[PDB]
Amino acid sequence: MKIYRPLWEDGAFLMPQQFQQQAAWDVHLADSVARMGLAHPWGVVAAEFDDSLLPLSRLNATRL
């Protein structure tokens, strides 16, 4: 998605797109570390709901 990491040497005006494109690159690097061995995308770690609210029907989550 055209990830552009900036460079700073001197005199550059700060502007949000240097920071937004920086932090997106660290995710994509950390993505490529995981896809070396496992060949799996992501998934669900923990998903716990509230059972006491069910017969009075609503649905509340606790940890997602």
Partner: protein
Amino acid sequence: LPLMLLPGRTAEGLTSLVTLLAPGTQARVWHHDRRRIPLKTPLTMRVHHPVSLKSRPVMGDHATDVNGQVLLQLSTQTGSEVQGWLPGGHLYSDLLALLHVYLGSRLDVRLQLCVERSLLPDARLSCRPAAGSPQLGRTAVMRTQAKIATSAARVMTISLGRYQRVQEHYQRKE
């Protein structure tokens, strides 16, 4: 000299000190403010079996002491003086007029400012980047006209310490 002859006074002399030094600038004082930390070195909320106390000392882990840290705002409208209050210009005028002449070790003084947007550049080298703690005046490439903002902070006019040490002798047995 007329103001420096009344003892233990006052708050209204700090209005004269600003209007003297650069006209076009006004001053307002808030007498108390929500100061923070001083972190107490024993946490003291151990609940004690042999001996404890109640009467005054009741808290959590960080204390709050209002008592002496007044807030001061300035308000300019000539841009030649906006670049005078950022550190280097007229900030050395107040910072020596307070600490040894009018206040000394009475109190601590917090400074603040409110202007229209800024005149502030960015990440150039060694020394003049910081507009106090914050940065702005670089991003509005959109709209023509004004928005009012607070500017920044300046440091307190304080002087303190502990020196290091423990002692060896005593006063007198009378």
